[PDB]
Design a protein around this ligand. Structure first.
Ligand SMILES: COCCN1CCN(CCn2ccc(Nc3ncc4c(n3)-c3c(nn(C)c3-c3ccccc3)C[C@H]4C)n2)CC1
Length: 284
């Protein structure tokens, strides 16, 4: 049972512009929110909805996810801005990530891409920046005692200034799963580290399908036998080294998300210590 609180916004303050794509509970829209953030007259938003066919229990669960998001204040995790519980349909207002999911964004930077924005593919500097941003958001989730369980490029988001953030998470994708998860169903921050390595592989391959040519049955056998992804053509050695650390068979040998940020801290944008969880007073 959900009880309305301080975060609640009036229904008519949100104007929906267009559909973005299907979410877990229903359709996600691109919208504009009137006076949602202090100092901002209008804010570009992503509005999560519950579809008509869903149950009251499913509608309550959606609002309980919004209650959880209230305590999340990381710059590298997509933030909740407000909620609408009174009436029908149920709404959850998130910050808009202007360039959408990381997978779709990486595919658009390919030479053959019909929707190429006239920009080059990610530079080594940009790849390292993305890696640290994803790892910082994941370090924040881990400090919050949450295991993602579904980390992949399709789940990471790109902001207007190209900042990468963790989208929706765990409050089968066999090609991103750690050997212990494929075998025993064990999901931890260490299995999330394995998936992070696959995300790095997606960045360097411009969102190619992992283990292309191998079926879901062959991926399961290959990964559990100690097999891992081959490095993509012209992959920078620094990113390859990160992938290898992520792909250790024993989850105990894999680095932590904070250790990843610590390995990359010196080669980042000057704003990183001003916005990161790693450099915040919360990282203790
Ligand atoms: C040159 O390329 C062509 C131009 N492109 C066209 C596509 N354009 C990009 C469009 N875009 C999609 C989405 C989103 N921005 C966005 N911000 C925030 C969210 C979501 N989307 C979101 C949410 N749940 N779900 C499920 C999604 C979702 C993801 C991918 C696709 C659909 C929906 C909730 C929060 C996390 N922005 C970027 C510019």
């Amino acid at each position: 049972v959900y009880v309305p609180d301080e975060w609640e916004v009036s229904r008519e303050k949100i104007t929906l512009l267009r559909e973005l794509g299907q979410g877990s509970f229903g359709m996600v829209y691109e919208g504009n929110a009137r006076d949602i953030i202090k100092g901002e007259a209008e804010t570009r938003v992503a509005v999560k909805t519950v579809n008509e066919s869903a149950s009251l229990r499913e509608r309550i669960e959606f609002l309980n996810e919004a209650s959880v998001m209230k305590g999340f204040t990381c710059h590298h995790v997509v933030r909740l801005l407000g909620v609408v519980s009174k009436g029908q349909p149920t709404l959850v207002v998130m910050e808009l990530m202007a360039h959408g999911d990381l997978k779709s964004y990486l595919r658009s930077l390919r030479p053959e891409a019909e929707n190429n924005p006239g920009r080059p593919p990610p530079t080594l500097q940009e790849m390292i920046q993305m890696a640290a941003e994803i790892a910082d958001g994941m370090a924040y989730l881990n400090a919050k005692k949450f295991v993602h369980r579904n980390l992949a490029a399709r789940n990471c988001m790109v902001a207007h200034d190209f900042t990468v953030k963790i989208g929706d998470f765990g409050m089968l994708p066999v090609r991103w799963m750690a050997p212990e998860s494929l075998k025993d169903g064990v999901f931890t921050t260490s299995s999330d580290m394995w998936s992070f390595g696959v995300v790095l592989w997606e960045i360097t391959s411009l969102a190619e399908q992992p283990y292309q040519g191998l079926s879901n049955e062959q991926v399961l056998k290959f990964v559990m036998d100690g097999g891992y992804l081959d490095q993509p053509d012209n992959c920078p050695e620094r990113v390859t080294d990160l992938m290898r650390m992520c792909w250790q068979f024993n989850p105990k040998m894999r680095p932590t998300f904070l250790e990843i940020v610590n390995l990359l801290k010196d080669d980042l944008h000057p704003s990183f210590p001003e916005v990161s969880f790693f450099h915040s007073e919360e990282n203790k």
